A = this chain, B = another copy of it.
Amino acid sequence: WVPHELNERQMERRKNTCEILLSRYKRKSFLHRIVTGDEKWIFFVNPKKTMLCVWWDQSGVIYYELLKPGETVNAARYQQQLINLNRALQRKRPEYQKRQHRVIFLHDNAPSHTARAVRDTLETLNWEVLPHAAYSPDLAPSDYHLFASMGHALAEQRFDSYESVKKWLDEWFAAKDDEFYWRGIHKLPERWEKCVASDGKYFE
């Protein structure tokens, strides 16, 4: 529940990561090459919880998976998600199909995200892996933008089935404007800047 108290180590990593990303961004914006993703539990009551695993960029959702009740993302499933995500990017993002742009990948450091096999796949796919700070959902567009917007809408839902969840998810992602996804990604520099100006603390 209540807000994690950052320690010195944590605030130092945040501040320093934000400085590095912000000075890079000022040299040359890279925001349009960011693909980012995160997992979120969705709860339904049967006549239970599924994990939503979703990846997106400034043009919209690229790929997602709703995992079967109770089941979880471990190192092996995540590696398989990335391989599928890549197949979906190739189909939905011609810029990358044509390898005229390298993907910049923004995910958190959940353990399944840094297992040996996942690291290997990431190198093979050869996406640039952006550094991500400990305890920083305020710097993760999936959390501060996508799932923040989604959680509100989901509050009013009482899902009946795994497949209702899926139905609701399809409509919800589609009814969002292109410019909704773009704003989510393009808010990053403002947040990196707030984070530097707080010295790595959480911010307003």
Please give the residue numbers on chain A whose beta carbons come within 8 Å of chain B beta carbons, in ascending order.
Answer: 1-5, 135-138, 148-149, 151-152, 155-156, 202
Which of B3, B149, B152, B155 is within 8 Å of A2, CB to CB? B3
A1–B152 contact, CB under 8 A?
no
- A151 vs B137: C-alpha distance when bound (angstroms): 18
Contact of A137 among B1, B4, B5, B148 (CB under 8 A): B1
Residues of B within 8 A of A3 (CB): 1-2, 4
Quote the shortest CB–CB distance from A147 to chain B (angstroms): 12
Residues of B within 8 A of A152 (CB): 151-152, 155-156
Are the C-beta atoms of A135 and B1 separated by less than 8 Å? yes
By beta carbon, the residue of chain B nearest A149 is B155
